[PDB]
Amino acid sequence: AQTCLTSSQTGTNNGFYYSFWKDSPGTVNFCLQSGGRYTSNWSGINNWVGGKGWQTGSRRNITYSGSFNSPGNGYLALYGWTTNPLVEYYVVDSWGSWRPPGSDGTFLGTVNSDGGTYDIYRAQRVNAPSIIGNATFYQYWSVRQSKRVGGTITTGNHFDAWASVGLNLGTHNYQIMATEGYQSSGSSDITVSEG
Numbered sequence: 001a002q003t004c005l006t007s008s009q010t011g012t013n014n015g016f017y018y019s020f021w022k023d024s025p026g027t028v029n030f031c032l033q034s035g036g037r038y039t040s041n042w043s044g045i046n047n048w049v050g051g052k053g054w055q056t057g058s059r060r061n062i063t064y065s066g067s068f069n070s071p072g073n074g075y076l077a078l079y080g081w082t083t084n085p086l087v088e089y090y091v092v093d094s095w096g097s098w099r100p101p102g103s104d105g106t107f108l109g110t111v112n113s114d115g116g117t118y119d120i121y122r123a124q125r126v127n128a129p130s131i132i133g134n135a136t137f138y139q140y141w142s143v144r145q146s147k148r149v150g151g152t153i154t155t156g157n158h159f160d161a162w163a164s165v166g167l168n169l170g171t172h173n174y175q176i177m178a179t180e181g182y183q184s185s186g187s188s189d190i191t192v193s194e195g
């Protein structure tokens with residue numbers, strides 16, 4: 001059954017944790033579906049990110065499938081946080097008009113995982129929204145060298161590769177298969193599972 005949300009919220013739905021966040025402009029209809037599924041549509045937003053997964057991240061292997069429709073700036077990524085240090089992390093499989101993280105990403109190397117090759121970056125967010133309120137913190141990124149929509153993400157491969165280039169993860173907070181939009185409009189329909 002469906003539960004559509006329009007304001008930032010976290011919780012559990014059909015055995016899966018979810019996180020949904022947007023800043024004030026525009027509209028996101030973040031619709032919780034059966035099992036590990038959610039849909040999104042966004043319009044006129046500034047920034048939003050949300051999806052289904054786990055309240056506490058781990059080295060679990062995560063599989064996802066579905067559709068991602070982003071003519072402007074959007075991302076389809078495994079997405080999560082740690083505390084101590086505060087870290088926002090991404091394993092980006094697809095994107096819209098703009099390949100992240102841009103020039104604010106420092107290239108650190110590559111990792112091969114799940115049939116793909118990913119570029120590794122560190123970026124810094126300055127006085128930016130976070131799971132602990134406005135903060136200044138690093139992001140760790142793996143970004144697939146070409147787009148893919150669907151498959152398995154062997155998280156351990158990414159975590160180990162980041163560690164090998166000095167990117168230390170803290171205590172795991174949430175870990176979700178996320179859709180992100182930036183100053184754009186679009187939609188997605190994504191189903192997650194582990195193991």
Ligand SMILES: COc1cc(/C=C/C(=O)OC[C@@H]2O[C@@H](O[C@@H]3[C@@H](O)[C@H](O[C@@H]4CO[C@@H](O)[C@H](O)[C@H]4O)OC[C@H]3O[C@@H]3OC[C@@H](O)[C@H](O)[C@H]3O)[C@@H](O)[C@H]2O)ccc1O
Pocket residue numbers: 047073097098100101102104124125126127128129139182183
């Ligand atoms: C005051 O509080 C605050 C602070 C921030 C931001 C803090 C910060 O450190 O970064 C500021 C800038 O945001 C990033 O921006 C990206 C933006 O440049 C990019 O635009 C592309 C550029 O090319 C064009 O051709 C594209 O059409 C256009 O879309 O889009 C992505 C932006 O970055 C995203 O921002 C949101 C994060 O969640 C994502 O991780 C990140 O990828 C940096 O490059 C800085 O220039 C924000 C909000 C508040 O309130």
Ligand SMILES: O[C@@H]1[C@@H](O)[C@H](O[C@@H]2CO[C@@H](O)[C@H](O)[C@H]2O)OC[C@H]1O
Pocket residue numbers: 008019021049129130131132133
């Ligand atoms: O109310 C708080 C939320 O606003 C906060 O949400 C985070 C804000 O930064 C976004 O980049 C994240 O995706 C989102 O989780 O989390 C903590 C909560 O208490």
Ligand code: NA
Pocket residue numbers: 091113114116152153154
């Ligand atoms: Na992967």
